[PDB]
Amino acid sequence: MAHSPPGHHSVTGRPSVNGLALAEYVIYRGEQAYPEYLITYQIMRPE
Amino acid sequence: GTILIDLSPDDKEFQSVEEEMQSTVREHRDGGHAGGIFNRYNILKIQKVCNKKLWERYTHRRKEVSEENHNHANERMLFHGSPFVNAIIHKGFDERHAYIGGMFGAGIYFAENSSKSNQYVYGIGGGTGCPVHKDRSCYICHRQLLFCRVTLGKSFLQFSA
Ligand SMILES: O=C1C[C@@H](c2ccc(O)cc2)Oc2ccccc21
Numbered sequence: 001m002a003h004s005p006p007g008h009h010s011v012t013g014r015p016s017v018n019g020l021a022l023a024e025y026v027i028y029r030g031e032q033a034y035p036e037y038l039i040t041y042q043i044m045r046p047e
Numbered sequence: 048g049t050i051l052i053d054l055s056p057d058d059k060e061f062q063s064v065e066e067e068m069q070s071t072v073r074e075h076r077d078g079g080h081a082g083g084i085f086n087r088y089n090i091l092k093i094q095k096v097c098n099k100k101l102w103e104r105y106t107h108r109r110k111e112v113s114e115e116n117h118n119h120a121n122e123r124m125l126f127h128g129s130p131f132v133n134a135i136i137h138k139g140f141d142e143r144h145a146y147i148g149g150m151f152g153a154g155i156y157f158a159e160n161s162s163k164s165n166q167y168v169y170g171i172g173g174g175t176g177c178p179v180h181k182d183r184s185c186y187i188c189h190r191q192l193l194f195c196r197v198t199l200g201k202s203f204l205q206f207s208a
């Protein structure tokens with residue numbers, strides 16, 4: 001595991017090209033996330 | 048010391064989580080290669096993860112970040128897709144769940160798009176798909192995602208492709 005940029009606690013990947021894409025984020029410390037919900041699913045074959 | 052509490056599909060908490068899952072599906076530039084081809088999910092179950100130790104550990108660190116960022120933890124709810132969700136819910140996130148070749152470096156990655164985290168459920172690039180059928184687009188096998196509370200604090204902003 002790497003380090004945050006100095007002075008920062010995480011990175012935000014803001015997609016600049018694909019307008020429909022939402023953001024992605026990166027933390028460098030496990031203790032900065034808590035897994036609250038476990039979701040069990042299937043993807044659905046489209047019509 | 049983890050326990051899983053089933054939410055009823057009639058509970059509003061189930062419903063708001065389902066909604067964030069379904070409404071954040073998008074199309075992917077790989078045409079479905081990594082995560083398969085779908086516009087929505089069949090949600091089979093939603094469980095609340097309860098672990099005292101892992102929670103206190105999260106809130107302790109959240110206060111530190113907050114105090115370093117004008118009392119603002121900048122907390123989000125984001126999706127994480129991984130082969131190791133069973134280890135994550137019992138022992139928490141650590142460096143064993145880091146994405147060493149990630150675009151923004153070796154850390155633990157989260158998505159606003161549920162469909163993005165889905166691409167990692169069977170491994171990086173979707174791995175070899177479901178264990179049963181070796182199908183990255185399996186419509187039969189059960190998948191699991193986590194919807195997580197993530198402390199971002201002061202986030203470095205990286206514009207990207
Ligand atoms: O939701 C995830 C999980 C993930 C990942 C999981 C396990 C692993 O070993 C490597 C990456 O990568 C991502 C990258 C970007 C956005 C979300 C994710």
Ligand SMILES: [Zn+2]
Nearest residue numbers: 177180185188
């Ligand atoms: Zn399968």
